[PDB]
C-alpha cells in the first residue's frame, strides 16, 4: 500500500472528522494514526459520512490538534500485541508498554474486534471452581468456564474481593488469568501492581500466571470503551492459540457501560433509558458472547459490576444481569456487621447450584443452610422487638446455630492481612461441605460463637474454641 | 436542502468574484456571528485545539470547536465588546497560568491576576491548564495522615494525602464549613516545620458570589491562615469559560506544590457548579448531547481533573496533592448524573445529612453513607486502636435505634446498646469552626469506647468532654505529651489513661 | 443590495452571483451565457438529470465541470467561478435553481416585470391588449418598470380570470364567486 | 448618521433587523423602531451576520410590517436617575407611569452595568431587627444583607414583603427602592396607595422611596429588563449619591421565567426542566449587581415563586446560591394556619452563628430546632400508634413541640385586616426571653390554644385569662 492521508476537518470532542481523499476510503472499525508530539493518536473509524469524510473516535487526548493534520490509516482494527510476553507486562489501551519494559510482542498482533464464537464452537461446562471462600463455595458454587459476576456497591472493598480471588485462585490453578481494569483508579493501579509483585504472581524475574491491562479513566471515553476489547483479545489468544484455560477478570463493567453511553452521545445517537446508549444491549452482548468455553479452550470470566446507588433495577445492571452465569451480591450491611466476605448469602444466586452438578449431598446441605439462615432472618424481627425469650426452644437452637453459621462464613483473606492482619484460609470444597453439615447437626454447638468468627475451617474453629477457653 | 457555514453570502460572493483571502485562514480570521458569548469566526486554519485567541476588541477566548470552516471561540468576556467582522489573531498558546509560592496569601482569578489586589504574583513558573495525571509508576501508596480535627472524620473516615474524598450533601449545608475545618487544623502543621509535612491549602470557589468569598477570606484572615493558603476564585459573575477553566488551572497550581515535593490539599467547591458551567458552555457550543441536562463527557472532564491528585513515590520527590470535591445534591438525589459520576471517581464519600444537622450534630456526617475506601493508613496508630469497635458500636446503635423508636419492651442487650449508643452520638457532636487536636481526641474516644461515659448522663456529656480535656491538661499533661510524641498507645499508656479516665468518671 | 432579495438557500448563491457581477457589470452577458449552457445542459440527457444528480465526488464533479466548460468555452468567467463554487459545495441539483433565480434578479434589474393572467381558456388578443394597457395605466404597474404579462390557461379555474403581479392580485374569477354564492345559500 | 435597518423577521417578540448600512450596533445596544402606536424599544442580542442582528423587543409587538425603519439608539437603554426618581413609578423605559411628568434627569445611565469588584466588596454584620418572632429567633437578618423568601403562593409572599416594608422601611431613613418585577397590577395599586398613605411617598411632600413597577401582563422581554433598570436606580443611590439604600425585588422568579421564555425564541436549545442554558450566567450577573460595596450598603429582599413548590427545580436552586439568608415559606405551614408561614426547619442565615447573636440566643434556637425535628420525626408513629402510646419522655416533647409550633405564630400588622386580628410586633430581646421561658416549661401549664395565633408571652397569659372565662 501507500500512505492513506486524511486531513482533519473538525475537532469537536472525541469526534474528529477526517477528510480522506477519493479511492483510499478506510473501513468501519479501522484504526487511523495521527503523528503527534504525544506519539500516535489512534482514531477508530466509526462512520462514513459521505464524500470521503469519516467520523472517528479519539483514543488519546485531542488537545492541540491543528486543523488539516495528516492522518495515516493502519488499515484495520487496533492491533494489539499478543504473546506469552503479555503475561507479566502492563500495556495501555493502544497496547503500548506502560510498565516501561520496552517492546512487548511475541510474533503476533491481533485485531481488537473479533467475531463471537459460533453455536457450533460452544461447549458446555460443568466443572466446579473452588475459591476457598467458604460462603462462595457452598452457597453460590462457581464453575470453571463460567461467567461469574460480582454485582455489588461502590468499590465496597470490591477490589479487595477480586484481589483475594486472584491471590488464591490464580496461584492455585495452572491456567493464565487476565486482569483488565476499565478506568480503575491510578491509586488502585499502583496497589494492584504492588500487591501482585508482593504476592509474586507478577514476578519480574520469571513468568507470571497473569497479564495486566490497566485502564485509567483519565483516558478519553473512547479509550475507556475499547479497553475491554483489547483485554478480551488477549484472553482469546490464550484460549485459542495457546489453547489453555484462562480466568479472565474485568473490572468494573459499569464503567464499560458508562464509557459507551458517553460515546453514543458523542456519536449523536439518541440515548435510551437513564441515558444509557441505544446500542447498550448489543455492545454488552458482543463482549459477553465473545467470552465463552469453546472446544478450543475455556475462559472463566469474573466481571465486576457496580450497581449505582445500589439500585439494580437501573437498566445497566439489569442488562448485565442476563448475560452473567453466576451472580454474587456483596452487601454493605454484611460488611458493616463486620463480616468480610461482604457477600450476602441469601441474595447471591448461582445457577450452578443445580443439585446434580454439585451433587445431592452438597445440594441438600446447602438447602438446609439456606433455610436455616432464612429462618434466622425472619426471626431477627421477632427477637429484636417482641423479644428473644418468646422464641421457641426449636427457634432458639436455629438462631444460635445461625449466629454461629453467620460468623462461620467470616473467614479471613490473605490480601486483607493489609486490610486486617489475620492470615487468610483456603478451605477445600469437601471440607466446607463437611463443616457446614456438622454445624447444622450441632456437633460443634459446644464451641463459642466468636470461635467461629473470622476463622477458616472446622479445625480452626475447634482450635479457636481452645484459645477462647484459655 | 443543505446549508453549509461557508454559504455565508460575503464569503460566497468573494469566491464567485474569484479572488479570496488566505492567511486570514491561517493566523487571523474574521468574526461573522457572535452572540451568547460564543463567537464563530471564519479562518484560523493554523489554530491548534484549546488555543487562546486574541479578539481585536481585546477579549481572549479559548477555542473549543474547530468546525469544518468556522472556529467556535468561547469568549472569556462579555460580547458587548466583541462585534461582528472583527479580526482575531491567534495567541498561539493553549492556556497557561503563572505558578509559584507567591500564590500564598493571594486571591487570584483563573488567569492568575490577584483579585485581592495584593500586587503582582511571585510566580516561579508558568504551567499549562491540562497536565495529564501522574502514572502508576509515579505513584506510591499513601502513608501520610491528614487529620481534619473533626473527630468523626478522622476516626470513621480517615483521610490521607493523595486520597480523593468526596464531600457530598445538600445545598448550602454550610458546605464550606466542613472544608474550612480541615484548613483550620492545618494551622497545627503550619506553625510547625518540615514543609512537606505541611498542607498548603488551595480553596477553589466556583460559582460563588464575591460576598461569600470575601467572608471566607475574612474568616481565614482572622485565623491568620491566609498566611499559608491560596484562594483561587471564579465568582458567579466571572465567565462560564473562566469557570470551566478554573478547576483545571487550580489543579496546575497544586501540581507546582507536588513538583516541589511538598504536600498540599485542594478543595474543589463546587464541582457541581463546574458541571452547570460546562452544561451551559456545551449547549451554547451547539454541543449535541443533553446528557440528562449535563452533556456527555462531563465524566471525562471530572475524571481527568481528579486523577491529577496523588501520592507520589520518593523518586518523584514524595509529593502529594490531596483533593476534596464538594457536590451539592438536589434533594439528596445521588442517582443524578453528576453525583453518580463523581462517586465512582472518588475514593471516599463523606455524606452529610440534613436531618442530623437539625438533630444537633453540626457538622453532621451520616456515617452510613460515608466510606473511605483507602481507610486506615493515614489514621493515627493510636487512634486506630481506640476507634476499632467505634464502628461496630455505631452500627449496632443504628439497628437498635430503629427498634427503639417503636419503644417496646427492650431486650437487655438492646437497651445496653441503646444507652451506650445515645452517649456515643452525643460524644461525636462537633462544634463549628473549632478543630480539636488528635492527641486530645484519643482520650475522648478511649473513654467512650471503654464505656466510662456510657453511665454518665446524656445531658452533661457536652460538659464532660470539655472538662475531661481540661483535667488531663491539668494533671495528665505528661500523658498528652506522650500521645503526641509517640502516636501509638503502649500498655502502660493505655493503663495510665484508663486510670485517669476512671478517676474522671466521678470527676 | 440586489433588486429584490428573494432570500432562501440556493438563492444565497444567486444573491452572491448577482452582486459579484453587478459590481463588475455585465449581468445580462452573464445571464445569457448561463442560460445558454443551462439550456444545452437540459438538452444533454446524461448530465441532463442523469449526472446532475449527486453520486459524484468533488473530484468526479470537478471533471464534470471541466466537460461543462468545454461545452461553451468562454461563458462569462464569473459563472465559471460559480461552477467551481458549485463543485466545491457539491450542489448541481440546484443548478437550474440558481439559474432561475439569477434570471429573476436580472430581469428585476432590467425592470422587466413579468406577470400572469391565469384564466380558464386562451383569451382574445384584444383582451390581452386591453388588460395590458389597463395594467400599465394602473397604480400597480405605473410603468417605468417594464411590463411583461403572460396569460396562462388553467382548467381548474372555471370561468373568469385573475391578474397577478407584485403580490397584488385582482381575482375576478367565476369559480370563486360561484363558491361564495353557493355557500351563502347553503346558510 | 443613524443606522437604518429593516425588519427582516418578527418571530414572536424577538424581532430581527437587517441594517442596510455597514455600521452594526453592538450587542446590548438599543434600537428604536418608531411605532404608529408610539415607539418600540428593541435591544440587540445576537449578531447572526449578513448584517442581520436578532433583537429582543421590549414592548408589545403587533402591527409590525417587515421592512419598517430601524434607528439605532446605541448602547443599553439609559434611564434617567437622580433624586428626582424618588416619588415616581417608572416604566421599563423609565418614563413615569404615575404621570408625574418627565423626570428632571441628572445622570442617565445604561441599564446594563458590570458587577462591582471583589476589592469593592466589604462584609457587614450588623443585626437588622425585624420584630417577627420566627425571623428574630431562627434567622436574624443583617443590615446590608440579601434576604430571601421562597414562597409558593404569592398571596402570602406579598403579605410577607408588605410586613417587611411596614417594619423595616419606616425605621430605615435612607433611600429605598421598590422594584416589583411582574406582579399584579391591583397589588401594585394597593402598594402605591398604601405608600402614599403612610407618607413614604408624599407626592406633594417628598418621597424617600422611588418605585419601579413591572406588571405581570407586560410582555416577557419587558419583564427581563425591568430588573436591570431597578438595579441601576439602586446603583445610582448606592454609588453616585452614596446613600445607604434598601431594595425590594419581588418576584424574581419572573426574571428567571422571562429568560426561559425568550431562550427558545433566541435560538437556544433549552436546558433541563425548561430553564435557559444561560441560567447561571444571567442569574449571576443580576445577583452580583446587587451588592454592599464599600461605597454603600443596600439591604436587598428577594422573593421567589418556587413553581409547584419544588425547591429541587434548578431555577430555585440557583437562586439559593446567591442569598445570605433565606426564610423558605411553604404551603404546609400555611395549612397549619400559622402566619408567618416560615418553615422553621427550612430557614438559615449566615448570622445564626453564636459569635454573632450570642451563645444564649443560639442555644435557645438550638433547642427549638431539635424539639421540632423530633416532633416531625414522630409524626409517622403518632398516626400509626396513638400519641398516648408514646414514651413518657416523648409525650413531654410532643406537648412542648405542639406548644412551640403554635407559639411561633404572630399576627401581622399590615394584614391585621386580613387575619382579622390586631397586629403584633414583638421586640427581639423580648422574643429570646419568651422562648427561653417556654423551653424551660415555665408557661407550660396553660392551654395550647392560648399560644395559637397570638404574640408575646404576656399576651399568652392574658389569653389564658380570656380562655378561662
CATH class of the largest domain in chain B: Alpha Beta
CATH architecture of the domain at 11-110 in chain C: Orthogonal Bundle
Helix content of chain B: 25-40%
Q: What is the CATH top level name of the domain at 11-110 in chain C?
A: Mainly Alpha
Beta-strand percentage range of chain B:
15-25%
Number of strands of chain B: 18
Quaternary state of this entry equals: part of a larger assembly
The arrangement of helices and strands of chain C along the chain is HHHHHEHEEEH
Radius of gyration of chain B (Å): 27 Å
Question: In total, how many beta strands of chain C?
Answer: 4
* Inertia-based shape of chain B: elongated
Number of H- or I-type helical stretches of chain C: 7
Largest interface chains and counts = A-B, 67 and 67 residues
| CATH fold assignment of the largest domain in chain B | Rossmann fold
GO molecular function (chain D): ATP binding; ATP hydrolysis activity; proton-transporting ATP synthase activity, rotational mechanism; proton-transporting ATPase activity, rotational mechanism
Keywords (chain D): ATP synthesis, ATP-binding, CF(1), Hydrogen ion transport, Ion transport, Membrane, Mitochondrion, Mitochondrion inner membrane, Nucleotide-binding, Phosphoprotein, Transit peptide, Translocase, Transport
GO cellular component, one term (chain D): proton-transporting ATP synthase complex
Main location (chain D): mitochondrion
Amino acid at each position: 500500500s501507500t500512505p492513506i492521508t486524511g486531513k482533519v476537518t473538525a475537532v469537536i470532542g472525541a469526534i474528529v472528522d477526517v477528510h480522506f481523499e477519493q479511492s483510499e476510503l478506510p473501513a468501519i472499525l479501522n484504526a487511523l494514526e495521527i503523528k503527534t508530539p504525544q506519539g500516535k493518536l489512534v482514531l477508530e473509524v466509526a462512520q462514513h459520512l459521505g464524500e470521503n469524510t469519516v467520523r472517528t473516535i479519539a483514543m488519546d487526548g485531542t488537545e492541540g490538534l491543528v486543523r488539516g493534520e495528516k492522518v495515516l490509516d493502519t488499515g484495520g482494527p487496533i492491533s494489539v500485541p499478543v504473546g506469552r510476553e503479555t503475561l507479566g507486562r502492563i500495556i495501555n489501551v493502544i497496547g503500548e508498554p506502560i510498565d516501561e519494559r520496552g517492546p512487548i510482542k511475541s510474533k503476533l498482533r491481533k485485531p481488537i474486534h473479533a467475531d463471537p464464537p459460533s453455536f457450533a464452537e460452544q461447549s458446555t461446562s460443568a466443572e466446579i471452581l473452588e475459591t476457598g471462600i467458604k460462603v462462595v463455595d457452598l452457597l453460590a458454587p462457581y464453575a470453571r468456564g463460567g461467567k461469574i459476576g460480582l454485582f455489588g456497591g461502590a468499590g465496597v472493598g470490591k477490589t479487595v474481593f477480586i484481589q483475594e480471588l486472584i491471590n488464591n485462585i490464580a496461584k492455585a490453578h495452572g491456567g493464565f488469568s487476565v486482569f483488565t481494569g476499565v478506568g480503575e483508579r491510578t491509586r488502585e493501579g499502583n496497589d494492584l501492581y504492588r500487591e501482585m509483585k508482593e504476592t509474586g504472581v507478577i514476578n519480574l524475574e520469571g513468568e507470571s500466571k497473569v497479564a495486566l491491562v490497566f485502564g485509567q479513566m483519565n483516558e478519553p471515553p473512547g479509550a475507556r470503551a475499547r479497553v475491554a476489547l483489547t483485554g478480551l483479545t488477549i484472553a482469546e489468544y490464550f484460549r485459542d492459540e495457546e489453547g489453555q484455560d484462562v480466568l479472565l477478570f474485568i473490572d468494573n463493567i459499569f464503567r464499560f457501560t458508562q464509557a459507551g453511553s458517553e460515546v453514543s452521545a458523542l456519536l449523536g445517537r439518541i440515548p435510551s433509558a437513564v441515558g444509557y446508549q441505544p446500542t447498550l444491549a448489543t455492545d454488552m452482548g458482543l463482549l459477553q458472547e465473545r467470552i465463552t468455553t469453546t472446544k478450543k479452550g475455556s475462559v472463566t470470566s469474573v466481571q465486576a459490576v457496580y450497581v449505582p446507588a445500589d439500585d439494580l433495577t437501573d437498566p445497566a445492571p439489569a442488562t448485565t444481569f442476563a448475560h452473567l452465569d453466576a451472580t454474587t451480591v456483596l452487601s454493605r450491611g454484611i460488611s458493616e456487621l463486620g463480616i468480610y466476605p461482604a457477600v450476602d448469602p441469601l441474595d447471591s444466586k448461582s445457577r450452578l447450584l443445580d443439585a446434580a452438578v454439585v451433587g445431592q449431598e452438597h445440594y441438600d446441605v446447602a438447602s438446609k443452610v439456606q433455610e436455616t439462615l432464612q429462618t434466622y432472618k425472619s426471626l431477627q424481627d421477632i427477637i429484636a422487638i417482641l423479644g428473644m425469650d418468646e422464641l421457641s426452644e426449636q427457634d432458639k437452637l436455629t438462631v444460635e446455630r445461625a449466629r454461629k453459621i453467620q460468623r462461620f462464613l467470616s473467614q479471613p483473606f490473605a490480601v486483607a492481612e493489609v486490610f486486617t492482619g489475620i492470615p487468610g484460609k483456603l478451605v477445600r470444597l469437601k471440607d466446607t461441605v463437611a463443616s457446614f453439615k456438622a454445624v447444622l447437626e450441632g456437633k460443634y454447638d459446644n464451641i463459642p460463637e466468636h470461635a467461629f468468627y473470622m476463622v477458616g475451617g472446622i479445625e480452626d474453629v475447634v482450635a479457636k474454641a481452645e484459645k477462647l477457653a484459655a | 436542502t443543505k446549508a453549509q457555514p461557508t454559504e455565508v453570502s460575503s464569503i460566497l460572493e468573494e469566491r464567485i468574484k474569484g479572488v479570496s483571502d488566505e492567511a486570514n485562514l491561517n493566523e487571523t480570521g474574521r468574526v461573522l456571528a457572535v452572540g451568547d458569548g460564543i463567537a464563530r469566526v471564519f479562518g484560523l486554519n493554523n489554530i491548534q485545539a484549546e488555543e487562546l485567541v486574541e479578539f481585536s476588541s481585546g477579549v481572549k477566548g479559548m477555542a473549543l470547536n474547530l468546525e469544518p470552516g468556522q472556529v467556535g471561540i468561547v469568549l472569556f468576556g462579555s460580547d458587548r465588546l466583541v462585534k461582528e467582522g472583527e479580526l482575531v489573531k491567534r495567541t498561539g498558546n493553549i492556556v497557561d497560568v503563572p505558578v509559584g509560592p507567591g500564590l500564598l496569601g493571594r486571591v487570584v482569578d483563573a488567569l492568575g491576576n490577584p483579585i485581592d489586589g495584593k500586587g503582582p504574583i511571585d510566580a516561579a513558573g508558568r504551567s499549562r491548564a491540562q497536565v495529564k495525571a501522574p502514572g502508576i509508576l509515579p505513584r506510591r501508596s499513601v502513608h501520610e495522615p491528614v487529620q481534619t480535627g473533626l473527630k468523626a472524620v478522622d476516626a470513621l473516615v480517615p483521610i490521607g494525602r493523595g486520597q480523593r474524598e468526596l464531600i457530598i450533601g445538600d445545598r448550602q449545608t454550610g458546605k464550606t464549613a466542613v472544608a474550612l475545618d480541615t484548613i483550620l487544623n492545618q494551622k497545627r502543621w503550619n506553625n510547625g516545620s518540615d514543609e512537606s509535612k505541611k498542607l498548603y491549602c488551595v480553596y477553589v470557589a466556583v460559582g460563588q458570589k464575591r460576598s461569600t468569598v470575601a467572608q471566607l477570606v475574612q474568616t481565614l484572615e482572622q485565623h491568620d491562615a491566609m498566611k499559608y493558603s491560596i484562594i483561587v476564585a471564579a465568582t458567579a459573575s466571572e465567565a462560564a469559560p473562566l469557570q470551566y477553566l478554573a478547576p483545571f488551572t487550580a489543579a496546575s497550581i497544586g501540581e507546582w506544590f507536588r513538583d516541589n515535593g511538598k504536600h498540599a490539599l485542594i478543595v474543589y467547591d463546587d464541582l457541581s457548579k463546574q458541571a452547570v458551567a460546562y452544561r451551559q458552555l456545551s449547549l451554547l457550543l451547539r454541543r449535541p448531547p443533553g446528557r440528562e441536562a449535563y452533556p456527555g463527557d462531563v465524566f471525562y472532564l471530572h475524571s481527568r481533573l481528579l486523577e491529577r491528585a496523588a501520592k507520589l513515590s520518593e523518586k518523584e520527590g514524595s509529593g502529594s496533592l490531596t483533593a476534596l470535591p464538594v457536590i451539592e445534591t438536589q434533594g439528596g438525589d445521588v442517582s443524578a448524573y453528576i453525583p453518580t459520576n463523581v462517586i465512582s471517581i472518588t475514593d471516599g464519600q463523606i455524606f452529610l445529612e440534613a436531618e442530623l444537622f437539625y438533630k444537633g450534630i453540626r457538622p453532621a456526617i451520616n456515617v452510613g453513607l460515608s466510606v473511605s475506601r483507602v481507610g486506615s493508613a493515614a489514621q493515627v496508630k493510636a487512634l486506630k486502636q481506640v476507634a476499632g469497635s467505634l464502628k461496630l458500636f455505631l452500627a449496632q446503635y443504628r439497628e437498635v435505634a430503629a427498634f427503639a423508636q417503636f419503644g417496646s419492651d427492650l431486650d437487655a442487650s438492646t437497651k445496653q446498646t441503646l444507652v451506650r449508643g445515645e452517649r456515643l452520638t452525643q460524644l461525636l457532636k462537633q462544634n463549628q469552626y473549632s478543630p480539636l487536636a488528635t492527641e486530645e481526641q484519643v482520650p475522648l474516644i478511649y473513654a467512650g469506647v471503654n464505656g466510662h461515659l456510657d453511665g454518665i448522663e446524656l445531658s452533661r456529656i457536652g460538659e464532660f468532654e470539655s472538662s475531661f480535656l481540661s483535667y488531663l491538661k491539668s494533671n495528665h499533661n505528661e500523658l498528652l505529651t506522650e500521645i503526641r510524641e509517640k502516636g501509638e498507645l503502649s500498655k502502660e499508656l493505655l493503663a495510665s489513661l484508663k486510670s485517669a479516665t476512671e478517676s474522671f468518671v466521678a470527676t | 443590495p440586489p433588486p429584490v432579495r428573494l432570500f432562501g438557500v440556493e438563492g444565497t448563491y444567486a444573491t452572491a452571483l448577482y452582486q459579484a457581477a453587478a459590481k463588475n457589470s455585465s449581468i445580462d452577458a452573464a445571464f445569457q451565457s448561463l442560460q445558454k449552457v443551462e439550456s444545452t445542459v437540459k438538452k444533454n440527457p446524461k448530465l441532463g438529470h442523469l449526472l446532475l444528480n449527486p453520486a459524484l465526488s468533488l473530484k468526479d464533479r470537478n471533471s464534470v465541470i471541466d466537460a461543462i466548460v468545454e461545452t461553451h468555452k468562454n461563458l462569462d468567467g464569473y459563472v465559471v467561478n460559480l461552477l467551481k463554487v458549485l463543485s466545491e459545495n457539491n450542489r448541481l441539483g440546484c443548478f437550474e435553481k440558481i439559474a432561475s433565480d439569477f434570471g429573476v434578479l436580472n430581469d428585476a434589474h432590467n425592470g422587466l416585470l413579468k406577470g400572469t393572467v391565469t384564466s380558464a381558456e386562451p383569451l382574445d388578443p384584444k383582451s390581452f391588449k386591453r388588460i395590458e394597457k389597463a395594467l400599465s395605466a394602473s397604480k400597480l404597474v405605473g410603468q417605468g418598470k417594464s411590463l411583461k404579462l403572460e396569460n396562462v390557461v388553467k382548467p381548474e379555474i372555471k370561468g373568469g380570470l385573475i391578474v397577478e403581479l407584485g403580490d397584488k392580485t385582482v381575482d375576478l374569477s367565476i369559480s370563486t364567486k360561484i363558491q361564495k354564492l353557493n355557500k351563502v345559500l347553503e346558510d
